[PDB]
């Protein structure tokens, strides 16, 4: 899953699933034990923003040809895990 | 009750009543004694967000057959408990 | 006056007179010496909100058959006691 | 000057000038020597709150009945005394 | 130029310049060595708000015959000294 | 450059260039070693205000007959320089 | 790509690629070990805002004969990097 994009300071950053989303990246000052990379997450379409895809964003791919999408919120966004 | 979905940081994760609410699930950053699982209570449709429940989350199931609703809140937003 | 509901944190509920609000419950929360059960006060409707009734809460009532309402606010909301 | 009505926290209560008012009763928590009853200060009309007289409050008697109006605002809203 | 009124907390008292403004008044609260009464400023009209003269205020006159005009506002909101 | 105007508080007084704007003046309470008299920025028209040319506050001149323009802002407005 | 303009504060001066961009200036607030420049982020047109380019600021220059955009914005509106 690991792919060049990290989430800083307390923003986490998840991956949508094919709002549900896989955690990916948790930011360095989201808590400690706060959530884990890999697990699943519901957050309201109006509580994230789409993150432009890292081949995207690294100028190799076009926004079409990427099947994946990348979404971030601030971690006190996130109330709950199905963990 | 314990299926899949646990209450993060501030939040709690309650289960609408057949906005009349039970306790499911209590962040592990509300302050200690704020209230139990099993608690019923009752909030305003504005305060209260819907929650994915946890089958359809993990794709088990499709929404509609779904008869249990989940919401979750901040704990500052609960008023009350009819305990 | 005590039925089952309980004021956490530092809200207030209050019960309306037949909005001239008669204190009911006092959060937790709400600092010591701040007011007492049975203190009449007065609050703008648009600072206080309306709280299901417990019986229709605990399902056994319908809303139509109760008589005493049920409101609660902020303790912050409050500027006297009619004491 | 003194009827049944109190203010708290760090609200104060005024009495409207036949917007002028005067002092009737300072929260306890409006810091030590910010004004003193009696004094006479203006606030802007949409700055402050009427409040319900206490004897309508206690039910004797009928708004309309009533000369005196009694008005609140927290204490950061008054500027001056024309002391 | 000393009357009956004076600025409490943190806000200032100024009078119009026949908006150009000279310091009637400072607010205990306002850090020492903010400003000084005498002192010339300027502040944007949505700023300021009009207090009224204490002549008005102590009931001796009427509105239209006072020519000074007071205003308030915040310490945080001066900028300037034409000092 | 120093006319009789300066900035108080965590404001920055700055004049606009022939928003390119040189800075003027630094309040006493804008960090140490945040900027220095003379430095250039830039700042989005929305973020500044006008402030009345010293002439014109002083009683002196004519807004009309004023090259000068002297605008101001909070420091944390600022992200740059050109220095 | 050192030119004359450096973020103050707790910003972040960017420079959109050819919102894809890359960090060419850190703000002496930003916490330490935040990024580091030459790092690439993506950030929502919105959440940024444009700034004039050091050689128009510095008056040598047209808007129109730049081709490279700097913009800024606060550190905490960054979630990633492509690293």
Known sequence: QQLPIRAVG???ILVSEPELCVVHS???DVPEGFCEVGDLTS???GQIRNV???FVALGL???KEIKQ???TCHYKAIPCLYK
Do not use: A, C, I, S
Request: hydrophobic fraction near 35%; charged fraction near 15%; avoid cysteine.
């Open 69 to 71: 999408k990348f979404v």
């Open 61 to 63: 791919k076009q926004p």
């Open 10 to 12: 307390e923003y986490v």
């Open 52 to 54: 432009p895809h890292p």
């Open 26 to 28: 948790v930011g360095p």
């Open 43 to 45: 957050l309201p379409v």
